[PDB]
């Protein structure tokens, strides 16, 4: 029901720009197979060499965000397409299509072994990482150019990254220009900063080591996104970053039942803003001196 | 009985820092516990250094290096600067 | 400047810290600037904590600092 019928990809009548030996996520078949990614007039095509029927076509009009993640501290280089409308790849509906290539290579030839050979292997691995990053970056720029300015190439700011649990594993969440992302592990996180209405920091209280971050979207029909188990050392940094991005935040000692709150807000959004809107998240509005000391 | 606590000094410091803020009694108990704890830590480490180096006097160097051991980077730097400034001005005066 | 705190521009008691360092069985002798240095450090640390506690109490629209804000 939510699969919008897309236009047909228009093949390029000349020699297309191509990226070879790429894996796709989600995989259209249970078998992981390397493919070739092609740039065409109105989109990109992934094509497996083993079966012609496992083609994945992505139109430029349907890409919302285009990310490039280099292989610096990771073992893989990535080209991620976040989509406006979800695509059917094999049996899975997905908003996210990732193209990646793992540099992980086994190098020790298990004649002599000693500190010179290991240093040469480490140098060869660094050269391979830098070559793959240059190849994928150039190809991602060529995708942005082929879009006629419809798609900007985003690169994550690693220095502004923080650790957290949006799903079931602890992962490094990375800010970009316009989005908060995690692309390394599946399931992927892509939060567009402009779609956020408010951020709530849960379990901010003295003696806890970790807090949770909740994103509420402007579209109240969209479920809230939780990023759990953020180290408290990152709290003041996250508050600063939310302020620098013009996102309002609130803090609370307790985890809220967002699934009840969002249903109340959906039932009457007008009455919600009439009362005061998001002000109820600021703990208790006593507005009076505590004067606990006698 | 005259019991000793750092409450008046914390009031002084607070008014120096936040003139329009007040402290509860329990927060003052916590602050007193904190001050006593830090004093105990620093004096014990200074004694440990003095015994390690076969000395029988606690001078400002032992306290300085104790602060260097206990506090983390920025905190240690600022607290060392503050202490040296205060000791220098007390000596000068 | 009679009190040793004044001669050092401090708010914590130099004399009490001196007495506690002496009547505390830490070392045979005590310097003259060790109490001053320690009082300076303690005052600095308390100011450091009270700044952030005041910030947190002001973010909760409260005039009184409570254990929650610490």
């Amino acid at each position: 029901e939510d699969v919008v019928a897309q236009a047909q990809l228009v093949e390029f009548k000349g020699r297309p720009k191509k990226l070879e030996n790429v894996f796709v996520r989600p995989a259209p078949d249970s078998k992981r197979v390397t493919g070739t990614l092609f740039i065409h007039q109105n989109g990109i095509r992934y094509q497996s060499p083993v079966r012609s029927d496992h083609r994945v076509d992505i139109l430029f009009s349907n890409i919302k965000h285009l990310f490039f993640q280099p292989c610096k501290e990771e073992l893989m280089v990535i080209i991620h397409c976040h989509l406006k409308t979800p695509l059917m790849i094999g049996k899975k509906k997905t908003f996210d299509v990732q193209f990646y290539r793992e540099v992980s290579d086994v190098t020790v030839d298990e004649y002599r072994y000693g500190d010179e050979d290991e240093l040469e292997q480490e140098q060869e691995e660094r050269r391979r990482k830098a070559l793959l990053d240059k190849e994928f970056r150039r190809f991602a720029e060529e995708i942005s150019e082929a879009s006629n300015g419809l798609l900007d190439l985003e690169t994550p700011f690693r220095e502004l990254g923080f650790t957290g649990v949006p799903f079931r594993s602890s992962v490094l969440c990375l800010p970009t220009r316009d989005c908060l992302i995690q692309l390394i592990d599946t399931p992927f996180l892509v939060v567009t900063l402009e779609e956020i209405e408010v951020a709530h920091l849960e379990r901010v209280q003295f003696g806890l080591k970790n807090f949770d971050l909740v994103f509420v979207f402007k579209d109240f029909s969209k479920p809230v996104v939780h990023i759990n188990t953020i180290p408290i050392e990152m709290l003041e940094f996250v508050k600063q970053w939310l302020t620098d991005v013009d996102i309002p935040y609130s803090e609370g000692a307790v985890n809220l039942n967002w699934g009840t709150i969002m249903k109340t807000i959906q039932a009457d959004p007008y009455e919600f803003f009439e009362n005061g809107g998001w002000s109820f998240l600021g703990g208790g509005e006593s507005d009076d001196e505590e004067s606990e000391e006698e | 009985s005259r019991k000793e606590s750092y409450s008046i000094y914390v009031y002084k410091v607070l008014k120096q820092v936040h003139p329009d803020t007040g402290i509860s009694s329990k927060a003052m108990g916590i602050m007193n516990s904190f001050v006593n704890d830090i004093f105990e830590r620093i004096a014990g480490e200074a004694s440990r250094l003095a015994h390690y180096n076969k000395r029988s006097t606690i001078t400002s160097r032992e306290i300085q290096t104790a602060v260097r051991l206990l506090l983390p980077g920025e905190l240690a730097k600022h607290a060392v600067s503050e202490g040296t400034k205060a000791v220098t001005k007390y000596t000068s005066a | 400047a009679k009190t040793r705190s004044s001669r050092a521009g401090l708010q914590f008691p130099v004399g009490r810290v001196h007495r506690l360092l002496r009547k505390g069985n830490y070392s045979e002798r005590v310097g003259a600037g060790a109490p001053v240095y320690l009082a300076a450090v303690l005052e600095y640390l308390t100011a450091e904590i009270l700044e952030l506690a005041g910030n947190a109490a002001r973010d909760n629209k409260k005039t009184r600092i409570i254990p929650r804000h610490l």
Partner: peptide
């Protein structure tokens, strides 16, 4: 520099942080 004037400066930048946050909620 001495630390008290930097914490005053940092906290005045934090008052601007709070003022921005108040403007964002309004």
């Amino acid at each position: 520099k001495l630390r008290n004037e930097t914490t005053n400066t940092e906290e005045e930048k934090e008052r601007l942080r709070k003022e921005i946050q108040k403007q964002l909620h309004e």
